[PDB]
Every structure is written in C-alpha cells, then in structure tokens.
Design an enzyme around this catalytic site. Sequence first.
Site, PDB file in Angstrom:
ATOM      1  N   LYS A   7      -6.090  -5.298   1.816  1.00 39.87           N
ATOM      2  CA  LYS A   7      -6.826  -4.316   2.148  1.00 39.87           C
ATOM      3  C   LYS A   7      -6.772  -3.490   1.409  1.00 39.87           C
ATOM      4  O   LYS A   7      -8.209  -2.515   1.856  1.00 39.87           O
ATOM      5  CB  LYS A   7      -6.153  -4.563   3.070  1.00 39.87           C
ATOM      6  N   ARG A  10      -8.867  -4.070  -1.453  1.00 41.47           N
ATOM      7  CA  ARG A  10     -10.869  -4.714  -0.350  1.00 41.47           C
ATOM      8  C   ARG A  10     -11.153  -2.677  -0.516  1.00 41.47           C
ATOM      9  O   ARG A  10     -12.131  -2.681  -0.946  1.00 41.47           O
ATOM     10  CB  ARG A  10     -11.084  -4.856   0.235  1.00 41.47           C
ATOM     11  N   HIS A  12     -11.056   0.343  -1.384  1.00 38.07           N
ATOM     12  CA  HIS A  12     -10.643   1.366  -2.107  1.00 38.07           C
ATOM     13  C   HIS A  12     -10.188   1.528  -3.460  1.00 38.07           C
ATOM     14  O   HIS A  12     -10.141   2.273  -4.248  1.00 38.07           O
ATOM     15  CB  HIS A  12      -8.950   2.103  -1.726  1.00 38.07           C
ATOM     16  N   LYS A  37     -17.548   2.311   9.321  1.00 37.48           N
ATOM     17  CA  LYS A  37     -15.941   2.911   8.633  1.00 37.48           C
ATOM     18  C   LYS A  37     -15.840   4.591   8.538  1.00 37.48           C
ATOM     19  O   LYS A  37     -17.201   4.442   6.654  1.00 37.48           O
ATOM     20  CB  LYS A  37     -15.153   2.196   7.526  1.00 37.48           C
ATOM     21  N   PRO A  38     -16.153   5.353   9.306  1.00 44.86           N
ATOM     22  CA  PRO A  38     -16.607   6.957   8.419  1.00 44.86           C
ATOM     23  C   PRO A  38     -16.683   7.569   7.357  1.00 44.86           C
ATOM     24  O   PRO A  38     -17.780   8.082   6.833  1.00 44.86           O
ATOM     25  CB  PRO A  38     -16.549   8.305   9.164  1.00 44.86           C
ATOM     26  N   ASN A  40     -14.380   7.321   3.251  1.00 38.88           N
ATOM     27  CA  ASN A  40     -13.388   5.767   2.486  1.00 38.88           C
ATOM     28  C   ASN A  40     -13.585   6.880   1.253  1.00 38.88           C
ATOM     29  O   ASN A  40     -14.339   7.720   0.835  1.00 38.88           O
ATOM     30  CB  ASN A  40     -14.582   4.823   2.577  1.00 38.88           C
ATOM     31  N   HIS A 115      -2.148   1.048   1.447  1.00 32.02           N
ATOM     32  CA  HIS A 115      -2.826   2.955   2.091  1.00 32.02           C
ATOM     33  C   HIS A 115      -3.002   3.837   1.316  1.00 32.02           C
ATOM     34  O   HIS A 115      -2.029   4.535   0.669  1.00 32.02           O
ATOM     35  CB  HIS A 115      -1.578   2.995   3.878  1.00 32.02           C
ATOM     36  N   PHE A 116      -3.810   4.032   1.546  1.00 36.93           N
ATOM     37  CA  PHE A 116      -4.555   5.386   0.833  1.00 36.93           C
ATOM     38  C   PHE A 116      -4.803   6.589   1.846  1.00 36.93           C
ATOM     39  O   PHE A 116      -5.343   6.859   2.986  1.00 36.93           O
ATOM     40  CB  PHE A 116      -6.045   5.369   1.013  1.00 36.93           C
ATOM     41  N   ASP A 117      -3.442   7.652   1.778  1.00 37.63           N
ATOM     42  CA  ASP A 117      -3.370   9.074   2.629  1.00 37.63           C
ATOM     43  C   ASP A 117      -3.683   9.868   2.441  1.00 37.63           C
ATOM     44  O   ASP A 117      -4.789  10.457   3.129  1.00 37.63           O
ATOM     45  CB  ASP A 117      -1.801   9.079   2.125  1.00 37.63           C
TER      46      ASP A 117
END
EC number: 4.6.1.18
Length: 120
Positions: A7, A10, A12, A37-38, A40, A115-117
Amino acid sequence: KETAAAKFERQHMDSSSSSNYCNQMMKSRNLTKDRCKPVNTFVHESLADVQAVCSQKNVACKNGQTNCYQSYSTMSITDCRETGSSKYPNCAYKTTQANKHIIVACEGNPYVPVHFDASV
C-alpha cells in the site's frame, strides 16, 4: 489483503511535473475510488533509497509509536492536495514539487516503509 508495504508503494512511490500530475496519479493509484483522498505525497527517489530510510534517523511517529524514520537526505517529492472546490467524483488536486526529508513508519521482514508520516 494488500500488505502495508505494498500500500505504501501504491500510495507514495513514483520513482519514474505537469500541473495535472496529481490528478492523473491520484487516479492511477486508486486514490480517487469511492472518495477523493484529500492529501497525498509521492516520493520520486528509487525504492531502494526510500527503503534505506528505515536504517536512518529513528524518530517518534505522529501516533506515538517509535518505528518512524526520517531520511537523512532531502528527497524529491510531490505534494498532492485536493483543491478547495474539488468534488467527488471529479477529484481535483494542486500539484506542488518539493525537496524535503521524509518520515516513514517501518515494519516487517524485509523492514520497509509501511506508512508516510510526514515531510519536513
């Protein structure tokens, strides 16, 4: 079930801009299905370079976990942010290019971003 690592890739990774870059990418990465998705961020470094962040600067995550890592170097990224007037299903984004450090959560075997923090 899509893995968290997959994910992350996909949502990021775009190692490969137009003002329309975000509109097309957010569509092609399935981030406009069901909702816009607001916000990214896409990272334009190699997958190897991003995965290497998991061996760089350990920092706290926003959620309080301790498995976050800040890239030592700045990285070429693109911020996609939904416009104030974007209305699903016609998702509209402003594309902004930047060079910033990324912060990702890392997990699993191999130990990779899940995860992108943030970018800083």
